[PDB]
């Protein structure tokens, strides 16, 4: 699988900006995506192709991909956003996921 590295957690207060990052070797050469997951639930795609939101995803979400590091940003983080965030990327059609970052609000 494709190697992806994430911090174990991010700690913010509600209303603050969250910063969740993911790094790799070829991450900046491809397209990154991010998922939001809660225990007992499927992951939800929030960001695809580096900085595009799927329809239905809150404007709180934004991101970028540079220097082989992808970032997910949540503006005005809500307690409803308290979830484990994962990064995803492909390498020559081979999948890979990051460890997952626990966001505490």
């Amino acid at each position: 699988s494709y190697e992806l590295t994430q911090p174990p957690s991010v700690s913010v207060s509600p209303g603050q900006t969250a910063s969740i990052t993911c790094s790799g070797d070829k991450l900046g050469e491809t397209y990154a995506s991010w998922y939001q997951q809660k225990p007992g639930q499927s992951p939800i795609l929030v960001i695809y192709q580096d900085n595009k939101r799927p329809s239905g995803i809150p404007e709180r979400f934004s991101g970028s991909n540079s220097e082989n590091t992808a970032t997910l940003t949540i503006s005005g983080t809500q307690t409803m956003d308290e979830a484990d965030y994962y990064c995803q990327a492909w390498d020559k059609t081979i999948a890979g996921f990051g460890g997952g970052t626990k966001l505490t609000v």
């Binding site: 397209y31 995506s33 499927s42 992951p43 795609l45 192709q49 995803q88 492909w90």
Partner: peptide
Amino acid sequence: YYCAHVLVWFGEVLPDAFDVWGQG
């Protein structure tokens, strides 16, 4: 186990992202 819809590129058949997910 989860199933999900897969977005794909058309020029070269490369995978993109999983958008629509089931329940697990």
